[PDB]
Amino acid sequence: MDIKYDVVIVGSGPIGCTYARELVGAGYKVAMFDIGEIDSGLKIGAHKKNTVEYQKNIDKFVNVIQGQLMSVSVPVNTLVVDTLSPTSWQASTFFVRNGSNPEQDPLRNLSGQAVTRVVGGMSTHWTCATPRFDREQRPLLVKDDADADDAEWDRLYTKAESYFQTGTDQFKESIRHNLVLNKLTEEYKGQRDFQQIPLAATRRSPTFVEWSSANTVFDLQNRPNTDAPEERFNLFPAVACERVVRNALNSEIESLHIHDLISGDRFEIKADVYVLTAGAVHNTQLLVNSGFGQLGRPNPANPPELLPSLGSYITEQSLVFCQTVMSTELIDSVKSDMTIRGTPGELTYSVTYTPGASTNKHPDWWNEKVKNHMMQHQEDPLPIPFEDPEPQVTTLFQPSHPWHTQIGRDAFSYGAVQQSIDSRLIVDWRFFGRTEPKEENKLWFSDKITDAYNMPQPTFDFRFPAGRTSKEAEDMMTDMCVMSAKIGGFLPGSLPQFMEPGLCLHLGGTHRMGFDEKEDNCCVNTDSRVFGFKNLFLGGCGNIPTAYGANPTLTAMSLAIKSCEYIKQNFTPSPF
Amino acid sequence: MDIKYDVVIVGSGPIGCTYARELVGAGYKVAMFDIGEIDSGLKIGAHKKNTVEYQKNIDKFVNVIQGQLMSVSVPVNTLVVDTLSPTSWQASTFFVRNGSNPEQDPLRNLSGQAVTRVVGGMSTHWTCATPRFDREQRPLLVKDDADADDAEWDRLYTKAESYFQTGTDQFKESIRHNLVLNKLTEEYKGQRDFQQIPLAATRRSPTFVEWSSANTVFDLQNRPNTDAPEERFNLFPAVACERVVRNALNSEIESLHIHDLISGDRFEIKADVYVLTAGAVHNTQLLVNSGFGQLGRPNPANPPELLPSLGSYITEQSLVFCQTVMSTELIDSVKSDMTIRGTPGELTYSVTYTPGASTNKHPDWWNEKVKNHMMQHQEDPLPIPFEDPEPQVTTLFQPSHPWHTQIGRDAFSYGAVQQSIDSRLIVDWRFFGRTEPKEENKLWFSDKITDAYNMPQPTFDFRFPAGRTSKEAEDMMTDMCVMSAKIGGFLPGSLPQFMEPGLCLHLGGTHRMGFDEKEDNCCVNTDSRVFGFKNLFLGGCGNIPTAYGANPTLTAMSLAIKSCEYIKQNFTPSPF
Amino acid sequence: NTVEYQKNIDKFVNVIQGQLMSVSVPVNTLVVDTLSPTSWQASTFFVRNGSNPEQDPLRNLSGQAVTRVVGGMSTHWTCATPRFDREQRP
Amino acid sequence: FSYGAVQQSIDSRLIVDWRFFGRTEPKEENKLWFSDKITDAYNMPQPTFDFRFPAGRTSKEAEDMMTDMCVMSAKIGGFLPGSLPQFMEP
Ligand SMILES: *Cc1cc2c(cc1C)Nc1c([nH]c(=O)[nH]c1=O)N2C[C@H](O)[C@H](O)[C@H](O)COP(=O)(O)OP(=O)(O)OC[C@H]1O[C@@H](n2cnc3c(N)ncnc32)[C@H](O)[C@@H]1O
Ligand SMILES: *Cc1cc2c(cc1C)Nc1c([nH]c(=O)[nH]c1=O)N2C[C@H](O)[C@H](O)[C@H](O)COP(=O)(O)OP(=O)(O)OC[C@H]1O[C@@H](n2cnc3c(N)ncnc32)[C@H](O)[C@@H]1O
Ligand SMILES: *Cc1cc2c(cc1C)Nc1c([nH]c(=O)[nH]c1=O)N2C[C@H](O)[C@H](O)[C@H](O)COP(=O)(O)OP(=O)(O)OC[C@H]1O[C@@H](n2cnc3c(N)ncnc32)[C@H](O)[C@@H]1O
Ligand SMILES: OC[C@H]1O[C@H](O)[C@H](F)[C@@H](O)[C@@H]1O
Ligand SMILES: OC[C@H]1O[C@H](O)[C@H](F)[C@@H](O)[C@@H]1O
């Protein structure tokens, strides 16, 4: 390993990989460190759902997600167990046990918040939904010129969409997708528009989708290599980055202190440019461990030297969820263009349709797939083919329905997987609310309790704010109940519910962007540069300072792209 | 991908890798195919528990196991869901839904039986317990010469242990391990012997154990490479192997028909030697799909032409389980040697001991870790260090207690993890019974229903035989209850129970070994060669024809080693 | 109408449950495959514990129950007595 | 007449129950009949139901009744975890 790089990036998630792709490509000498290890196959940091096996058994993938979601703060446990044998050892108190955080108020937590430590970060498991924010949800990159701001966002999002391979066509031939899309489109005719959820993914075959990931942004291969002989990049896994060292004036970072988890060695790495893309929780941790913000329980009477807004104004989305069982009317409608004679399972049975007829409700490709299913499988009481892909439907956030929606099938199931109801009939509903940024909603770090990596224990103090956030969240619930009913009734065991706070994993605003540190209560400027510091940048959803409902990663990547433009303008690459 | 090889091996689990290690090392041009993918880090086929993150969060690893255990045979669901909305599509019958298997009698199943399809097979998640079988549990390799039979098993087992890196001292300085070991040794003094579970594992650090896997046996890198420039090996993942093609004379295999899951194409691969190591269920399936045994529901009236014992005499072990909460007595004994000064928490408290004192109940390494824990953490009410490894205790199968036992902490938890009870108090108990082989116990494959890879659906017809197998299982349950109580009372939520049949994943005898096809009711001889066929071999637990309690993989590997000696004598490698 | 029930109203569900005897219970087909190998075990889902083998589980009023006490179900009911409007009324 | 375990963490003063009841079209095919072989606990012919909620108006109204309860109840408060909106056993 070297002493000296042009750029060091902490984290190999998709935002770290945006920095690598831009900067490695512009000829910089780059080092990237990740605390986790390579475990997606030979494609480093690729999506773990891209196996033939997982896509043939998609109900098993929730186990992969759960296997790499380590809860951020778990309050001390007060469950009463009073049926132990009298011979068994017991304490007299609910003591600090099993890694629990005694700092944590269990009634002001994001109990669902979790972090992932593997190369490629959470993008090794994510859903790949990559919608744009509309103006209402989106921070300003230019003030008092709406159209210049629009132009800037379009340019950045479009680039971000190409890095992720975002598209809205991958589910276009699914019967279930179109069944639900078309019904919703008809029902809300000229009140709401419906489309495919924009997905970072390329379809390989009718039965396989290559989901995008960090690896899609940047392959993570060490460089120079035969394909990139003039490029310079080293990935160092199993390396806990612990502190950036500030000069006395607080105007520059002088080194990054790391801990090699395999050898146990501790080094200081030198770079011209330090980029922190370790996640919304862990960027905050690392900065606090470095003397930014304030360590320990908040105390106003001791304002911090640097970045007093660090860990304040945190946001996380309210999430409501249910599943439905497709209505008889919609199932019957799948076979509306068919002529069905005789009795299934006998040689007199037949199913036909008229090709190209304009009274047909469905296209030929639909009617052919129904025909073939019904004729080849006459034991089956449903008209939907067995390998039909799932719906992937959304009506994006608008001011009159200020929530994001995802309607279809999600690998991240939240309860035991039902087996009594045919999976073809099941549609999932997830609506995501925006949360107002409020100073009192905080991520902070213990001065005494440490985590499994001996760094300061994260602790949340969060409640969904009264006023607009709370009113929207409940109207969002009612809207899900109202809309889902147009498709079918609720599946027992998946009735409408709010999910645990933070189960979303869309936390933002932990190290938020604005134009002015004081007036905008923020930590980085629009170049993602930490105020005061020449050479320290933050990347990730932690930057986003607004109340947003839609999935944030595309927006974070867009920001990282703009940040890299500043870097190219102000630092020169070392000669090869 | 060439068209011609010396040896083709189906499956990259530890038994296929044994064939690889032996025949690649001997100069053969070998190809190995696996229906699954490289998913598991840069060490191809390695244990997935070998990450810093999993060993810092071992309670998460159950998720990785669950995520790659795909149920073999799920009977049609008859759960009544009578609270759907009246507008939802509702079933009139319990029809065949969600990949369930209508051939399956739910009351004669191995419901717990499951398969793993990833490079390295189940050795990417297994517990790594590798005991030897004593005579009583073990098939004969030599007739009429018990001492010759024993010497041959010693020779094979010793190689096998070397390939897996089996050892019995990786947990020797664990306090919990010795706490339970010593207590059971004393309680059963002169009656039974206790020891560490033999484990395929090398300790690297006091908090990390490099668990062995297929990778340990054979690293799975394509050859030639720098380190082995005269060897020839190719691994082809994502290739479903479907049939071995018999010549009309049924004396030889002419090719292996494969389906490349990525391109979708099907090819015929030619080899001199064909080795099937696809696991106990899938070797059988591949054979039946190739014309061996009998496809479809068993029908005696029309006996099969080849291998009429295939899929018969199957054995699976009974498994009882519980967890206990450590007795007050044993916890207090942990600190028996300490001198304790003052009262916990101030600059004044002191904990000390005398190294070497004859009055000491525990060694110096034990007291030192204890002392240190009680001084670095005076708030903690327990004397067990936070980083102390789990117990790994067994008393091995004997005539007077004919069950294998594993006592400690298994990463394969069967219910939600308790967080109310301190984990350092918890000890798991897994006792495993042996099942007599009976012709009526069967694994067979549907002539109509197919699985996710369009192969004949597997179906169990199984019950634990009445008589000794059943009497022994119930006796085993009482023994766990009686033995466990010497350590502590049961943990609510983990009360003593029989696990689902097949949850063991120790299925044997599906393609069983013996000396004489007819007299021993078997499919392969002691070279693992399929009777009548010059160039087809089967490896794996499916070969083991006896009633066994202990974990079978080491014994399967031993048989594979012997098989390789035959191949090496009877086939010549192609020139390089 | 006891002081003790109206002081502990949460408890009266037990009284209701205790005198609702189910009308028709279909034959049970739950799989229990973790019995000890020594215990007597069914080969079939035979008619057990009062179940009715005539009853299709899927065309049932499973929640239907009856009460056999003097005063019948009025000994536990909710006492809601609305009139029907014409729409609902014979 | 509570349907699930009585929850204890939320102050009972905050809790409001909602029950909305639909009307069911009378249909000849919806039947209560009595076995000629099976008997009940008083040795009388065992009752058997053959019942589905009629398609059409009864079904439409039932789903609409659910939606109305989600809409109405939200004016008072959000759903209590464990008593989420659900159809009860027929
Ligand atoms: C788990 C999850 C996540 C999302 C979806 C579904 C599920 C179940 N679905 C999804 C998401 N977001 C979208 O916009 N759309 C979707 O459909 N999910 C969230 C998404 O996954 C995240 O927003 C995104 O990855 C964040 O990218 P990032 O800022 O690059 O952050 P990551 O957490 O992915 O990666 C950071 C990284 O750094 C490491 N690390 C952490 N601490 C350290 C230290 N101290 N030193 C070194 N490295 C560190 C990690 O190990 C990790 O790889
Ligand atoms: C899952 C597990 C299993 C074990 C333990 C714990 C758990 C949770 N613990 C354990 C075991 N056994 C031991 O002796 N001791 C213990 O502590 N477990 C069982 C052990 O894991 C197995 O006995 C062993 O791997 C079997 O080895 P194998 O005979 O080589 O078989 P695998 O199942 O490992 O590998 C088969 C392999 O071939 C593939 N495959 C399947 N079908 C096909 C077809 N048609 N074409 C091509 N390839 C195919 C798989 O994908 C797989 O990798
Ligand atoms: C259990 C229940 C019932 C009602 C509500 C709440 C609950 C949990 N609440 C309620 C009801 N109705 C309302 O209009 N408003 C609400 O708030 N419930 C229904 C109500 O309880 C019934 O509709 C009402 O009692 C019916 O009155 P009935 O026609 O007089 O019938 P009962 O079932 O009350 O009593 C009949 C009776 O005769 C007996 N019996 C049964 N078979 C025989 C035979 N062969 N021989 C002799 N006697 C027989 C019973 O034992 C019983 O006492
Ligand atoms: O569980 C909440 C999640 O639900 C959906 O899968 C979304 F796509 C994702 O952005 C989110 O994290
Ligand atoms: O859950 C059953 C499992 O329990 C223990 O882990 C044993 F090591 C293993 O051989 C077995 O498969």
Residue numbers in the entry:
A (entry chain B), B (entry chain A): 43 to 618
C (entry chain D): 92 to 181
D (entry chain D): 454 to 543
Paper text:
The H450G/V546C variant combines the two mutations H450G and V546C, which individually promotes Gal turnover. However, the overall Glc-to-Gal selectivity ratio for the V546C mutant was increased relative to the wild type. By combining the two aforementioned mutations, H450G and V546C, a third enzyme variant was investigated that showed increased Gal conversion and decreased turnover of Glc accompanied by slightly increased binding constants for both substrates, leading to a Glc-to-Gal selectivity ratio that was decreased relative the wild type, but higher than for H450G. When the competing binding mode (3-oxidation) is concerned, there is a clear difference between the more “wild-type-like” variants H167A and V546C compared with the variants carrying the H450G replacement. That H450G and H450G/V546C show identical stabilization of the α-anomeric configuration of 2FGlc and 2FGal (3-oxidation mode of Glc and Gal), while V546C does not, supports that this is a unique property of introducing the His450→Gly replacement, and independent of the mutation at position 546. Since the structural integrity and conformation of Thr169 is crucial for proper wild-type catalytic activity, its involvement in coordinating the O1 hydroxyl group of 2FGlc in the H450G variants is interesting. Conceivably, this interaction leads to unfavorable conformational restriction of the threonine side chain, forming an α-anomeric trap for Thr169 that stabilizes the competing 3-oxidation binding mode, and may prevent the substrate from rapid dissociation and re-binding in a productive mode. This is expected to result in an overall lower turnover rate of Glc 2-oxidation for H450G and H450G/V546C relative to H167A and V546C, which is also the case. In the H450G/V546C mutant, the selectivity ratio with O2 as electron acceptor shows a 27-fold preference of Glc over Gal.
